[PDB]
Structure formats: structure tokens, C-alpha cells
Design a protein around this nucleic acid. Structure first.
Lengths: 129, 151, 149, 141, 262
RNA sequence: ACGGGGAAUCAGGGUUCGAUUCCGGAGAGGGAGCCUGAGAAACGGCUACCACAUCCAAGGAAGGCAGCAGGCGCGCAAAUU
RNA sequence: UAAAGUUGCUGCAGUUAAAAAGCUCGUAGUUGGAUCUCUCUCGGCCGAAGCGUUUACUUUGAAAAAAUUAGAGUGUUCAAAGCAGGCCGCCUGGAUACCGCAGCUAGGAAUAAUGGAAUAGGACCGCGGUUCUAUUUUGUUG
RNA sequence: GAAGACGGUCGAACUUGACUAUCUAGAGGAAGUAAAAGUCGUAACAAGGUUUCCGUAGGUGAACCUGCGGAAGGAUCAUUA
């Protein structure tokens, strides 16, 4: 059975972007998926997306702009402190110039730079670059 | 019920129960005062402790035990001794190399006063640390919260 | 995939997006409730009641007309069966397989299928005990389970 | 695949601990059979008494007589065979005299074309074989 | 070990004594006395290491056995006498008086006081109890017992003892807005106004203190010592007034002092 | 296998070590039992047994270096009576 | 010990090189789909209480021997070190960080677990019914 | 108020029981490894001259042979209405 719908969504986006497609369908949608996608889009990595509302669990059509190299999930959601963030960045990101680690913190879902700005830690959801 | 099921007389040591009775001293009632105390930390004395008749010298409310130290919680797993139960504390231990956890548990033999009737398996008990009461008992049941499923 | 088979079938119902009562359907919610009561008094399980209401009376979904599900209506009126119908049918199938195996002792396939059926029975019974639908002392024993049938 | 759960630490640690025993070097170090079987008993060197001079044939691709000595270790009375490394150095060793022997350099494995020999003589009669070989010292009289 | 220990190792000694790691194996094990082992300053450390009046422990012994040192107005000849917080050390031969008061770094300072200030001291009352025909008694942080205290003095308050008579003269209640030193923990030596007290029944109460410079910190209630009523201390404060500077500000002050001096 | 502080190595993880001067525990050849004392089941205290062992006029007496040096033994392995 | 990503948590392999149980069921273990955005004595709506729904997480604050490690100052002739020293009696240091897990504390409320109302012995609201109720008798209590 | 005695208790002690200890009394029995393979064959690698191999069972100087079921890692990805 499927656990971690966010893992499925991120793998689908990755597989579609590697084939050079312009849109990708994601099912099921969820709040965490929508927040992760919003974080990706605010940095110009995906583009606009539409939430198709069926009465069971929505779908998302994500417009792809080919600026994405890898969007991935980190399972399990390890708790990350502000000290461990540098080690996680070294492990996951391809460079200190770009790439983002997405965390879920009590202040919301945000990239690692925004988590350093608010001086907060949390649980690692995934990464994208 | 008869509270005298032992080879010795059971009584609250701080209560004098044979103060002299006369015609004025008895008007249709013998009367028997009940020693109870309010333990600290916001715990309220159960009604059965105040208006009961049991004799338990290890009871936190009517006995001779001072609640000081750790105040822990557990889940009742065995009720098969006299005035003592076995609770299970479940926790997660962090292994650092794998950055992960493992389930661990510890059993705790804790004293349960006769003031807590209708305590079941699966009930949550808040226990307080006291002096050693037996070879293994060091905690007294202060509060009982029933498991989800009361109807 | 199936819990006890290598099958990966997809066949299932597909509810329409609209949750409203059909325009053709003129039965009031109380009318559907009385039809449900009549069918239950006839001796039918909620699945059968729903099938009959869909096929003959045009009730596409009872939940959308009455705002309630068939089993909930039967319980609220007080004429729901003692044990849930899925568990009942699983026990009935197990009883049938055991009756067949009594007179056919060389059927290893029947023994294997009985093992699968009783595993399904136990899983469903544990779930029902968790939900307080069955008493906590309820147990499926294969000695007089035909009485439960 | 392997388990990835926040509560799998016991599973991961236990599986690693069981699978470490299939490591030949780890098992050799932690089982205790190799230490028992080791004639030196965990020591780097050992003193022994030369029982006889033995000539060991080099393995088949090569051809020579490796001049070794059988020695009996004082610590445990075990009998080992130790190479006398350089040339003419077998003439520096007599019978029934004390020699310091060390490993041959492979941590208990035979070296080169010398079958079943894993020790080498370092000293004879409390004088190093290097000193006698270079003429810096002479064996005591 | 059987029975009490009688030695203190040099490296295991309290850090605030500021002892070397090469001038011997042992540190002076302070004698039993009014102050705890780890919260005191032995007389030998004060006379030799602090004031440089002696170069050896033998010279400290000579000074103390000439009956020149008074501690709280009484002559002490014990070179390992535990002197501690708020104590008064009088040397009448040289005509000086010192008070044992913490620096912001948590170390007893060489804080000279006037001969008229050396007539009193401040003591935090550790307990109050009624005994033996209802006579109230009070026990302070100097382990000194005072009979018939004011019925308004409670635990955690501060009382001004006259050293000549030993009697209480005045007292400060433990209340918000009162000045206090911190006598233990990370904030040891800091001075500030009590702003809040969080009561934790069955555990340690936590007292919040605000510095004179707007800095705030917290300690355990046992680490608070009421110094003055309001924001005015009843004793003379050391050079730093209880203001703990960060390392950057201390470096800046040191550089300014170097510029002014050379 | 005395425990810890800690040590070696190490990109991030980790691996191995910690008898050893600081803290805590234990022991004084092995067991056991005590006296005195605030504090010892103390051994540079006593009592006995087991092992070892010293002097003797054979009646008896005396012993405990895992304190500092030093000796023997052991060993690959460690200093001045 | 590193090299050894040849013990692989990061991070290894398992068709043929060493390797997936003959095959299913199955308890523990592990992992689990979507979904819920102005309340107690006051002399500053102006001191306060929680009596209410628990934790994990994260941030913070206490408390936490020294020595060692990191690290500030300081020409040991330099350095390893040391905790000294500097100026013409005086001036100045003897810092600071880290101290994991567990325990304590206070903000946040995403993520994850968890809870109530379904025979209503459910929430709020006013009514029918009981008590020495530390005073509802400056007067000797009754 | 000393010696002494009954009893108690703690309790070391030549307690009349299973010697995990390499060492030897071992001639012993059957197995692993570099063999001038010395001798005797040629089981496998080519259809290896009876295709090979797996499990099981019997038989044999010896490699092995044979029966039953299986695999291709075969010497057939194929054989015609």
C-alpha cells in the first residue's frame, strides 16, 4: 500500500521533469503536498499548479518549467535542529549557492534559509534543486 | 465490610476511638472520626478516602507515607497482589549512530490504596514517589484516569 | 492487491461528483427510511437493501437522500443484526467449508482456503473488538460457529 | 531493501551486530579461538629455546632451502618454526640456546615461498641477528 | 572510604580560587565552618594568593598566629578557615577591612570597605523555627542562630547583623523590585532587581532578575541574595556593579584602557 | 570488564581504547569474625581457619610491600635499597 | 584507527561474480491514505487564574567538578608549555564556548500519535427537592 | 568482678564425587592440505566421445554407474495442415 503521499508526488514530478514534460498529474493531493509545491514555486522551480477537487481526495496538475534537477523526499522525517541544518545541507544540496531543504516547523513549512531566519528547527520533509 | 481480617487490630494510629461514652456522650450514634490528609501538588483526596473505612498505612491520603520526589505516569497491566499493582511505562530510547529510536518499557510495582476501586487493566495512573514500601515498591498511586472507552 | 490472493483487480463502484438527490427521485427521506425498515423486516442485510433500492426504487445513494447510511438507520430504528454482515458472511463461508471438509478429508485445497477464511475472520473480529462493535470476550471458535450462522 | 523507520534503531543495531560476525577479521579478533591458537598468545615477540635446525623447501615456483629453526617457547612450551632471515645467520645459531622470535609480517600468515613458517628470529643469545650479521657484536663466550 | 576525607586535590579544588596546576598537588582543604567547602575562600588563599601578604603557607601561618586577622569581628587563627559571602575580614595592623563579595566572573573580589561599613554584614535567613517554650529562632547563611527575630522576617529575606553585638538591626523582604546578588550558578556575581518569581511546588522556584543595564537572567531561589531595598544596595558594590559584560564589550574596554595607558 | 571524566583515529557518520596521577567503587595472600571509636567489618589493628613462611635451647614465639626504595619469580615488557 | 561505500544510519550488495526462505498464512516488531482556520482580595478593559484537551518535535531558560579538547589575553628568547604579567607604589588577567541521553522550565503549534456527543447516564441554561455547613445572637453559651 | 560451662548466631575449616586442564597412556579410527601422480585409469571442460547438473535411493578399485522426478547453466529461442 502507499505511505508518504508526498514521496509519490515528488517522484512523479521528478520523473515527469526528467522526460521533459510540461505538466504532471499528482494524486492524491494533500496539505503537505500543496505547501511543499508552494515552496518550490516561490523559488521559481515549478510554476503554477491547479488543484482538481474531487469529493474524495484532490489531484494536482503541476506546470513544469524545466528548472528542476531533483525534487526528493527524506524518509523518515528526522527531527532537525538548527545545528544539524548545516550537515543536512552539506549532505543533500549540490552547492551552497542554490538548492533548498524543506522543513516542517511549528511556524509552517519552509525552506532551510527561512528556518534559519526565524531561528527554528523541525522535521525534514525533502529537498529540491 | 469487616476491616478486621488480620491477626492484629487494624486502626488509624492517630485516631482515638474509645473516648469515654456516657448518656450525653451517646445519642443514637457511636461516631468514628476518619484521619485523612491533603497531599500536595494539587492532588485532591478521593471521596472514598474521606468517607471510607479501610485501614491502609501505605495509603497516601489516610496512611503514613509522604509523597516527595518524582511524579510519574503509567498504564495498569497487572492487578493481582494485595493493594499493589504492576504498571508499565513505555518510552523511546534514542540510538545516536542510527539517529533513530527503539521501544523500551519498564514495569513498576506501585501501591494502590483501597480508595481506588474500579481500576482496570489499561487504566492510566499518576503515581508519586515515596519511601520504600516493600522490596520493590517505591511509588504510590495518586490519581487514576480511565482508559478511553468509558460509556 | 487482494489481501489473500495475487489478484490486482480494479473493479469497484465510482461515485458521481454530485452529492445531491437526483431530480427524477421523488421519494422523501422518510419514504426511503420506511422502505429500508420494510426491507430489513423482510430479513435483508444492508448491502441487499441498498442494492434493491438502487435497482428498483431508483435510490442512487441512501446517504444522499436521508443524510444517513443504511446500517446507521437500521441501528437507530433498533433492527440492526447482532454482528456485522461482513463478519457474518465470513463465518458462514467458514462453516460451509468446514462442513465440506468433514466429509472430504483429502481436500488440501479446502483446508488451505479454510485457513485463509479464518484468518480473514480473525482480522475482522479484532478490528470490530477495537471499535467496541463486538464484546471484548467475543471469540470465533470452530465448534459451534454454525449457531452463529 | 532495508528498514527506514524512526523506531527501527533496535532492528538496525541488532542486524549490524549479527552481520558483523560474518566479517572474517572481526570474528577472528572477537571469537577468542585465534588468540588461543596463537603460539605467542597475543604477544608481539616471544623467547624460545632452539630444538634443532630445520631446512624448509621453498614453494614450487621458486627453488631454495630456507634455513629455519624449530624453537620451543618458554612461556607456554609450544613448538614453532622460525625463519633465520639473512645469509650465514644459521651459523650464528647453535642448538639449545635462547632466541627472540617475532612475527613474519603478515599477522599470522605465511610470507613468500616459506610454507607453514610465520615467525622470524630477531635475537640469538641476547644478541640481535643484525648486529652479528654486520659484525657490530659477537655472540657471548 | 572510611570516615571523613581530610585532603583536597589542587585540580579538584573550587575553580574560583584561581589556583595553579603546578604549585603542588594539594589545595588547602577548608576547615568545617559557617560556609560550604565549594562556596568559601580559605584564609590562606586570601592572605597569600589574593593580597600577596605572604609568599608561602608558613607566612600565612605566622600572620594568622600573630592574631592579626579578624573575621566578622572575631580573631581567627585557622589558616584554612572557610570565609564566604558577605563576610568581613579586618586587618587592624594595616588598618584595612575587606568584604567577601563576588565578581561578575563568579570569583571573590578584593573589595575594600570603610571601617564604619565593617561594623555590620548582611545574612540571608535560611530558616525560621520556633523552639523550647515558643522562642522563635532564625538560621542564616552563616550558620548563625539568632533568637527572637522580628516576626516579619521570613525565609529568603535578608537581615543586617551588627557584628559587635550579633543582633538584628534591619531587614529586607524578598519581593519584586528589590536588589539582589546571585550567589550560585551561571549568573553568579550578577546584581539586579527582582522582577518575577515562578513558584514550582515540590521543586525549585525560579527567580528572574533584571540588570541595571536592561539585561535579564534567571536563577534558582536558593541562588538569590537580597542585597538592598529597592534598587539601592545596603553595601558597597565592587568595581563592576554586577553588570556582566559580554566578551566583546570586555575586549573593547581592554583596548580602550590599553590606548589610554599604552 | 573496575565505572566515568577522558584517549587515538576520524570530511560528514563512525571505529577502537580508557590498569594509569581527577571523581566514584573495591581490596590489602584467601575466606570469616570482631574490638576501639564520631567514623573500620581497618589489616603499616586484633581473633581463627586455609596456603605460604621466619626464629627456637622444641617448651614456645612471631608474620602479611596491590606504601617508598630494593630482591626473586614471571615474562616481549618497566628506574635509586 | 583511517584507507573500508570490503559491515554501508549517512552508504554496500543479493538474475549470471557470495547471496531471495519451496510456497502461503500468521502474533509481536516496523510502517501506515484524504480530511478539522474576555472569569478568583488590586491604590498601573488596570496585579490574575488555569481546573481546561496529553505527549513527541523545535526554540528558550535554569542546573550541570576541575583537568583534557575548542577558544580569549599574555614575546617561555621562540615553541611544546605556563597562568602569568604590565608601567613609573600603580594598572590588569586568571575569559568564553561545548557538556550528548534522561530529569526540570517556558514560548511555537506545522508534522506525527492521541481524546470527546451515537442506547446520549452530551454541552449551556434556569427550576423540584439535603446536610455541624470553623458563626447566620459583645446577651452567661441555650 | 577473671577463668570456665549450656544454649544461640555468624561462620572460616583435609567437604569421603560428574576431573571444560594444552599436557600425555595412544599403538588407535576416519577425514583436510602443497603429490618426481610414483601407479592405475580418464569422471568433467568440444555432442569431452553415454549432453551436463540438482534432489533421492541402491551399487562400485577409483574417478563414478544406474533408477525416479527435475533444470538448461544445452547441443533446440524455430519445423510449417
Amino acid at each position: 500500500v502507499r505511505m508518504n503521499v508526498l514521496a509519490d508526488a515528488l517522484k512523479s514530478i521528478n520523473n515527469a521533469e526528467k522526460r521533459g514534460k510540461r505538466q504532471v498529474l499528482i494524486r492524491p493531493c494533500s496539505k503537505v503536498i500543496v505547501r511543499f509545491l508552494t515552496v518550490m514555486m516561490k523559488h521559481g522551480y515549478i510554476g503554477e499548479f491547479e488543484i482538481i477537487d474531487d469529493h474524495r481526495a484532490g489531484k494536482i496538475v503541476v506546470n513544469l518549467t524545466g528548472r528542476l534537477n531533483k525534487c526528493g523526499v527524506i524518509s523518515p522525517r528526522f527531527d532537525v535542529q538548527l545545528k544539524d541544518l548545516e550537515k543536512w545541507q552539506n549532505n543533500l544540496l549540490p552547492s551552497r549557492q542554490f538548492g533548498f531543504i524543506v522543513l516542517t516547523t511549528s511556524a509552517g513549512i519552509m525552506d532551510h534559509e527561512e528556518a534559519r531566519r526565524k531561528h527554528t528547527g523541525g522535521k525534514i520533509l525533502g529537498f529540491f534543486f | 465490610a469487616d476491616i478486621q481480617t488480620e491477626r492484629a487490630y487494624q486502626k488509624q494510629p492517630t485516631i482515638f476511638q474509645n473516648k469515654k461514652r456516657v448518656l450525653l456522650g451517646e445519642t443514637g450514634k457511636e461516631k468514628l472520626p476518619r484521619y485523612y490528609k491533603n497531599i500536595g501538588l494539587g492532588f485532591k483526596t478521593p471521596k472514598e478516602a474521606i468517607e471510607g473505612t479501610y485501614i491502609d498505612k501505605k495509603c497516601p491520603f489516610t496512611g503514613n507515607v509522604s509523597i516527595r520526589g518524582r511524579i510519574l505516569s503509567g498504564v495498569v497491566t497487572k492487578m493481582k497482589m494485595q493493594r499493589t499493582i504492576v504498571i508499565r511505562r513505555d518510552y523511546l530510547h534514542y540510538i545516536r549512530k542510527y539517529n533513530r529510536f527503539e521501544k523500551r518499557h519498564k514495569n513498576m510495582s506501585v501501591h494502590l490504596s483501597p480508595c481506588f476501586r474500579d481500576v482496570q487493566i489499561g487504566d492510566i495512573v499518576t503515581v508519586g514517589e515515596c519511601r520504600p514500601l516493600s522490596k520493590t515498591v517505591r511509588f504510590n498511586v495518586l490519581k487514576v484516569t480511565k482508559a478511553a472507552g468509558t460509556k | 492487491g487482494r489481501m489473500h490472493a495475487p489478484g490486482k483487480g480494479l473493479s469497484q463502484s465510482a461515485l458521481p461528483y454530485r452529492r445531491s438527490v437526483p431530480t427524477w427521485l421523488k421519494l422523501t427521506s422518510d419514504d426511503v427510511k420506511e422502505q429500508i425498515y420494510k426491507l430489513a423486516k423482510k430479513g435483508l442485510t444492508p448491502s441487499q437493501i441498498g442494492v434493491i433500492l438502487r435497482d428498483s426504487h431508483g435510490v442512487a445513494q441512501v446517504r444522499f437522500v436521508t443524510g444517513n447510511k443504511i446500517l446507521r438507520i437500521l441501528k437507530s430504528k433498533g433492527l440492526a443484526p447482532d454482528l456485522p454482515e461482513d463478519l457474518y458472511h465470513l463465518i458462514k463461508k467458514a462453516v460451509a467449508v468446514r462442513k465440506h471438509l468433514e466429509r472430504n478429508r483429502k481436500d488440501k485445497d479446502a483446508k488451505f482456503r479454510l485457513i485463509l477464511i479464518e484468518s480473514r475472520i480473525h482480522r475482522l473480529a479484532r478490528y470490530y473488538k477495537t471499535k467496541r462493535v463486538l464484546p471484548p470476550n467475543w471469540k470465533y471458535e470452530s465448534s459451534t460457529a454454525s449457531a452463529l450462522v | 531493501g532495508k528498514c527506514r523507520g524512526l523506531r527501527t534503531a533496535r532492528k538496525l543495531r541488532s542486524h549490524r551486530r549479527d552481520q558483523k560476525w560474518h566479517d572474517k577479521q572481526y570474528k577472528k579478533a572477537h571469537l577468542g579461538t585465534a588468540l588461543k591458537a596463537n603460539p605467542f598468545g597475543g604477544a608481539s615477540h616471544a623467547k624460545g629455546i632452539v630444538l634443532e635446525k630445520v631446512g624448509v623447501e621453498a614453494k614450487q615456483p621458486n627453488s631454495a632451502i630456507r634455513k629455519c629453526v624449530r624453537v620451543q617457547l618458554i612461556k607456554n612450551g609450544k613448538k614453532i618454526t622460525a625463519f633465520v632471515p639473512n645469509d650465514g645467520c644459521l651459523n650464528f645459531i647453535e642448538e639449545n640456546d635462547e632466541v627472540l622470535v617475532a612475527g613474519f609480517g603478515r599477522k599470522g600468515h605465511a610470507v613468500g615461498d616459506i610454507p607453514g613458517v610465520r615467525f622470524k628470529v630477531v635475537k640469538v643469545a641476547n644478541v640481535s641477528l643484525l648486529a652479528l650479521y654486520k659484525g657490530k657484536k659477537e655472540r657471548p663466550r | 572510604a572510611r570516615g571523613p576525607k581530610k585532603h583536597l586535590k589542587r585540580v579538584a579544588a573550587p575553580k574560583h580560587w584561581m589556583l595553579d596546576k603546578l604549585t603542588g598537588v594539594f589545595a588547602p582543604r577548608p576547615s568545617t565552618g559557617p560556609h560550604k567547602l565549594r562556596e568559601c575562600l580559605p584564609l590562606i588563599i586570601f592572605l597569600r594568593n589574593r593580597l600577596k601578604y605572604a609568599l608561602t603557607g608558613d607566612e600565612v601561618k605566622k600572620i594568622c598566629m600573630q592574631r592579626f586577622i579578624k573575621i566578622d569581628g572575631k580573631v581567627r587563627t585557622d589558616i584554612t578557615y572557610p570565609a564566604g559571602f558577605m563576610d568581613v575580614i579586618s586587618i587592624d595592623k594595616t588598618g584595612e577591612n575587606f568584604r567577601l563579595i563576588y565578581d561578575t566572573k563568579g570569583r571573590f573580589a578584593v573589595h575594600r570597605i570603610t571601617p564604619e561599613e565593617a561594623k555590620y554584614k548582611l545574612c540571608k535567613v535560611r530558616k525560621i523555627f520556633v523552639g523550647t517554650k515558643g522562642i522563635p529562632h532564625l538560621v542564616t547563611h552563616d550558620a548563625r542562630t539568632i533568637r527572637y527575630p522580628d516576626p516579619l522576617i521570613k525565609v529568603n529575606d535578608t537581615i543586617q547583623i551588627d557584628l559587635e553585638t550579633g543582633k538584628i538591626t534591619d531587614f529586607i523582604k524578598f519581593d519584586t523590585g528589590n536588589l539582589c546578588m546571585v550567589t550560585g550558578g551561571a549568573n553568579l556575581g550578577r546584581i539586579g532587581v527582582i522582577t518575577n518569581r515562578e513558584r514550582h511546588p515540590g521543586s525549585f522556584d525560579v527567580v528572574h532578575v533584571k540588570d541595571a543595564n536592561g539585561n535579564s537572567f534567571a536563577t534558582r531561589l536558593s541562588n538569590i541574595f537580597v542585597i538592598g531595598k529597592g534598587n539601592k544596595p545596603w553595601i558597597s558594590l565592587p568595581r563592576g556593579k554586577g553588570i556582566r559584560l559580554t566578551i566583546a564589550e570586555e575586549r573593547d574596554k581592554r583596548l580602550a584602557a590599553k590606548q589610554s595607558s599604552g
